[PDB]
Paper text:
In spite of the low particle count, we obtained the SsChPV capsid structure at a resolution of 2.93 Å. The SsChPV capsid structure also displays the canonical eight-stranded jelly roll core and long linking loops that are typical of the Parvoviridae. In PV structures, the twofold symmetry axis is typically supported by direct interactions between the β-strands of the jelly roll core, but SsChPV’s β-sheets are too far apart to interact. The wall of this opening comprises three α-helices, donated by the GH4 subloop of each subunit. In SsChPV, however, the ascending and descending stems of the DE loop comprise flexible coils instead of β-strands, which prevent the formation of a similarly long, more rigid channel wall.
Chapparvoviruses (ChPVs) comprise a divergent lineage of the Parvoviridae ssDNA virus family and evolved to infect vertebrate animals independently from the Parvovirinae subfamily. Here, we report the first structural analysis of a ChPV, represented by the fish pathogen, Syngnathus scovelli chapparvovirus (SsChPV). SsChPV is a pathogen of the gulf pipefish (Syngnathus scovelli) and is a member of the exclusively fish-infecting ChPV genus, the Ichthamaparvovirus. The SsChPV capsid exhibits T = 1 icosahedral symmetry and is assembled from 60 copies of a single VP.
Numbering used by the authors:
A (entry chain A), B (entry chain A), C (entry chain A), D (entry chain A): 1 to 80, 88 to 356
Write the structure that this text describes.
């Protein structure tokens, strides 16, 4: 099936604070001023009804592609009194298919779909900016200042978004078929069981929450650390939960969704000061997911606990994304990221 | 190549003891009365000569498909005096390709091929019945009583076996190529060896026994537990051998052989009592295995220790299935399930 | 791209010291007298400029095939006075595509490309001979003496190299696409990071050296030991670094480069003594590697630390092969074998 | 099926020591200097794996043809210091299809297939020479000196083998279909039984050994002695085991494999002394055997006791060739030569 969700966001022309000239830092970090379209987690693509349509009555699903269309550019200027006029300026759209930029920082209650007018809970929905860091290896003596990432170095690949009835599209296609079960629990072999020998036990990834889980996990490195790092057993990373529990191999994408960058063109005046030009944009996040319909030999539908909208007075409401918790299917790969699961029945001593 | 083995077994019409109405149990288990055709292990498909033909003079093999034909239905009634007459009744044949039913419990000396007349060691060869369990996740509050598995809910997929010259076929096709070596031992890299550095050592899965080993291992969950469960190090399942040693990844099937269910139609009298109708059936278990012939540069054939028929006076005879123990081939995946292996030469301190 | 390197080496007709007739040894080892063409590591195929052309300006590469042509056979006899005459004799060329022979022992500064005249640092470049070992499993009682490897048992597959303008070619083709990044470092997920939560850290395989690293790693067994061996936790192999850190799964070849065997025909006189016939051969090692060009959005090229030629007075010079150490790409598989890596920034407590 | 085995042997140019001029002997014997290719027994054609492939899973077999290709002639001269040069000389190859030469003397552990390099257990594999004997009948007064066998008398049928890339082929085709069972034991008629009347007993040729048994027995004369010789009962030959037990009539070949003769050309110097020229030759012994596959109605394969490799410390290893010892088939001819058999059950008084 295919999900499409539109909302309004704001972008600016913050200048690229090019790599620091001062004292050298091994992870040399700087602000690029480029806004990053949120395209990593499920909540960045799906409303709760989209998630329910995805999980309900389907036994497996796989992500086929993602797409974002930025359109209806309405530029705004403030005389620091808010003029809605600009014609010549444009936005810079760049897709990092080189995967040389840092992954998106986790969003804290993005919830851009409950407030689609551009004012999320009484605050302007300004897109998050990207802060780039330059990491050289420890042994090398290269100066990081020379290796600053800049899409203008690949300006032949930069698309521009003019104001008005114009649209710039970001596109991603899955180059691998990663089918995920919609059920959070599977059976063990009676001969190869963690419970009572020659008896049936079930492991279940508990209900948890999938709004902030990556649509493309791509956590391959975590599994590789335990395979390639020859540090002694007293090393710090061996006790880290990320290294210990990397995530299912058949669940991570080799070519995940890249970072999508958009930015108003920065302009400077005679006093070497950036003149600020904000713009409203209609962001249409679209996700394509292939599904296999579910045909279980039962009378009931598996509908409860899939979504749980939580709201308390004066607190920001939110709805959790969850999988089917009722019946285990013993074929397919568990979909949820590494989280504390349970065993049914509980293991003995 | 292709293996076919026929034998006679018996089935009944035990009623489906639908989910318990009484006190709720998280693994709500009940008897479905459905007989399960043994189709999981090697001994369910292969006689010792079939196993020897499979392993001898082949360097690799892969399971292509499995098939079971149930025919020559001879129904019997007992006046609790054994009438061999029934014409209208029929059997219910259902294949669980949804993989929502528990895996087959291990067979204790099934040995249905040494006694093919229907009387295994002076006991009627009645097929094993399936006891279904309903596992919901711990957190959910769903009542398991409503989620009882029943093929009559998918009665459009139920095939029927009439008595007489009739046949119902169960079919399974491998959707993945899982090639397994016929040799139980391989070499290490001299640069990446567990023994003496820059020296040759060999790991060998010992002779063991493969009669009860799954033809399609499908033990994927065991490897996933160590990748997704974020329980603390003191958790019970971390010390379980099943979790610690899951089995070779390249050895497990993603779409293994499903459970095949057959059942006489249950009938009830005025006193609400099941009237018992037993039937003899000719079961023809068939397995297709692709093989690559072996062309080693040696003078001897690797024939010993492949099968070891054990018989002691007054004890039930049995023959063990084993792989080629003589020469290691350093390419391909070891075939045997996780079992205590040896190193040649033994590792130093 | 495609790399070709020619050099001169020497081969002899050392007789096959067939399996020992004396006291039995479980790893029964003997000298076969067959010379083994060095074809396992990068330095066996690539000069430093070839390695730099491979790594520089490429973001990924995969090994497509390897080839060795042995030609210009000039046989020599010594009257133990060095006659360069022989016409009827020939060499025996055999490829072990059965993978039943031990892997090549690590070469100690092979460096056959700096001295291509046949005299490496004032020593004749005689090809290394193969010592074959017969490993049976511990439990079996088979005599290893009967299972000696000998290509004359497959003499229908032996190619012969006549002296003069003649050539015998060894060929290997990769049957799997194993793409490797040219960068030694990748980013972590902020949500699934070993460092500060919701913050960016990088794992980096340090610079190390890749001259002696396998062009086809094929270290699958090491990862399988932790999946199939059910020995108790106090077993010797559980603390071995090879078992603990097997290497990246997506990095090992299922069908690596086999051993290539060449040997002068052995001849014996009336006193049952081998008459020694040495021959000079022109060895042309050729490797085909597919590459994807690198198009990073940076101004600098990543050129330093890729190769570091080390020379000290009166010590044999050597050049190290290394990957790109400057910029991490978060897609693809790390290329280097298991070696002590670093984290940027360093992990906290 | 078809068996091919290659190995290296040595031949010389020993002069034909033409019939003795001295005192006359009725069996006038002399050395012809012609090397005889071993082509009479099973071990001259089959490795143990070839024998196992022949006997296992086959109920009958017949010898179709035999072939020997002598090639890769490398001549050697010793200055009684071992020169590998000769171009003009050649070998003389002659096939005795007249069957006028003595049959091959039994080989004492020929075992040329375990050591195929030309040095069998630290001794040069020189081919056995043929010593011809001239037998006239007792009554006749012909001088045997005039009837010396010499292929130069039929030099139009002599093939020559030049050194280098040249090959001379010996060929034999069976002109009769002699099918032999692979089972060493058969049933008797209850009406015509040596045991209890109207009861079942089995005669079994015991396991014994078939490495030195003729591939073509051709022992017709032994059976004819008891049919044509009218000597009195006190004659010496009536108590000989060869006459008493000739061998199965349906087992002997009327046109067996003839003697194959090869010889370096003899050359003489001014002092009437033979100048010795030894040559290495690649002997490729090939045997074609038709087989009928075995389809017994049993579960086990008949694999044990077929071959028994015997090795003791410091003693030359050897493997015995044997037939199927488990199940008697009551049709076909027993394959083994006359040897002490057993009866099951044992005969009463």
């Amino acid at each position: 099936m295919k999900f499409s969700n539109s909302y309004y966001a704001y972008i600016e022309n913050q200048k690229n604070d090019y790599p620091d000239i001062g004292l050298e830092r091994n992870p040399s970090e700087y602000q690029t001023g480029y806004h990053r379209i949120p395209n990593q987690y499920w909540a960045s693509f799906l409303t709760p009804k989209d998630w329910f349509n995805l999980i309900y009555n389907n036994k497996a699903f796989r992500v086929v592609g993602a797409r974002c269309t930025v359109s209806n550019m309405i530029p705004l200027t403030e005389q620091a009194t808010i003029t809605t006029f600009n014609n010549t300026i444009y936005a810079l759209c760049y897709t990092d298919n080189n995967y040389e930029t840092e992954w998106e920082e986790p969003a804290a209650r993005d919830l851009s779909f409950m407030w689609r007018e551009g004012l999320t809970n009484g605050a302007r929905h300004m897109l998050p900016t990207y802060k780039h860091g330059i990491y050289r290896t420890t042994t090398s003596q290269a100066h990081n200042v020379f290796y600053g990432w800049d899409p203008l170095c690949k300006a032949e690949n930069i698309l521009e978004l003019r104001p008005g009835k114009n649209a710039v599209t970001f596109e991603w296609h899955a180059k691998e078929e990663i089918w995920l079960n919609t059920h959070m629990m599977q059976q063990f072999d009676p001969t190869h069981t963690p419970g009572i020998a020659n008896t049936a036990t079930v492991y279940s990834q508990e209900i948890h929450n999938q709004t902030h889980s990556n649509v493309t996990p791509h956590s391959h490195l975590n599994r590789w650390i335990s395979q390639t790092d020859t540090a002694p057993a007293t090393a710090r990373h061996w006790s880290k939960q990320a290294i210990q529990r990397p995530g299912i191999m058949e669940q991570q994408f080799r070519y995940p969704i890249p970072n999508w960058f958009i930015k108003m063109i920065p302009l400077f005046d005679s006093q070497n000061n950036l003149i600020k030009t904000t713009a409203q944009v209609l962001i249409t996040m679209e996700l394509t997911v292939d599904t296999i319909p579910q045909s279980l030999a039962i009378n009931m539908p598996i509908i409860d606990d899939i979504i749980a909208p939580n709201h308390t007075p004066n607190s920001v409401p939110y709805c959790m994304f969850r999988y089917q918790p009722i019946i285990p299917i013993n074929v397919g790969v568990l979909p949820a990221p590494p989280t504390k699961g349970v065993f049914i029945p509980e293991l003995p001593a």
